[PDB]
Amino acid sequence: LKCNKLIPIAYKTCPEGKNLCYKMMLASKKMVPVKRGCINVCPKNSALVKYVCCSTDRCN
Amino acid sequence: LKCNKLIPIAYKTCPEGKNLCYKMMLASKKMVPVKRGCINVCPKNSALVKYVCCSTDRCN
């Protein structure tokens, strides 16, 4: 699918096995995103590094 | 992991192998939750049914 990059005015198309989109935010205040892309599996949240996944074109 | 239920005033703890929280919504106009729970993997999005996964207590 199509997934947004850090500055989401741009997006990438995903390699096979990259069936998911995701956000990577730092708890440091309020979820400032620090990574955005295509993922295979939705990553588990750390105390400060949060992941939020979706499967629709440029949703992240 | 603690995940919210359909009516979010409630939440449930998840079994093992069920490491992420998720919201299941209908695309039919406003984005409306039809399911909420604990899950294995983040489910891929259908035309009409989207899913957003997270992993922090009661993030769904």
What does this structure look like?
Two copies of one chain form a homodimer. Chain A has 60 residues and is mainly beta. The first copy, chain A, has one domain: Ribbon (CD59). Helix content of chain A is 0%, strand content 45%. Chain A contains no helices and five strands. In chain A, strands 4-3-5 form a three-stranded antiparallel β-sheet, with no helix packed on it. Chain A is globular. Chain A starts with a strand and ends in a 6-residue tail after the last strand. Strand 5 of chain A pairs antiparallel with strand 5 of chain B. Chains A, B: This is Cytotoxin 4. Chains A, B: Keywords: Cardiotoxin, Cytolysis, Disulfide bond, Membrane, Secreted, Target cell membrane, Target membrane, Toxin. Chains A, B: One of its GO terms (cellular component) is other organism cell membrane.
- The string of secondary-structure elements of chain A, in order, is EEEEE
CATH class of chain A: Mainly Beta
CATH superfamily of chain A: CD59
Tell me the count of domains of chain A. 1
Biggest sheet architecture of chain A: 3 strands, antiparallel
Class by alpha and beta content of chain A: mainly beta
**How large, in whole angstroms, is the Cα Rg of chain A?**
11 Å
Content of β-strand of chain A: over 45%
**Most extensive protein-chain contact, per-chain counts:** A-B, 15 and 15 residues
Shape of chain A: globular
Please identify, by name, the CATH architecture of chain A: Ribbon
Here the CATH topology of chain A equals: CD59
Largest sheet, spatial ordering of strands of chain A: 4-3-5
GO molecular function (chains A, B): toxin activity
Keywords (chains A, B): Cardiotoxin, Cytolysis, Disulfide bond, Membrane, Secreted, Target cell membrane, Target membrane, Toxin
Subunit structure (chains A, B): Monomer in solution; Homodimer and oligomer in the presence of negatively charged lipids forming a pore with a size ranging between 20 and 30 Angstroms.
Subcellular location (chains A, B): Secreted; Target cell membrane
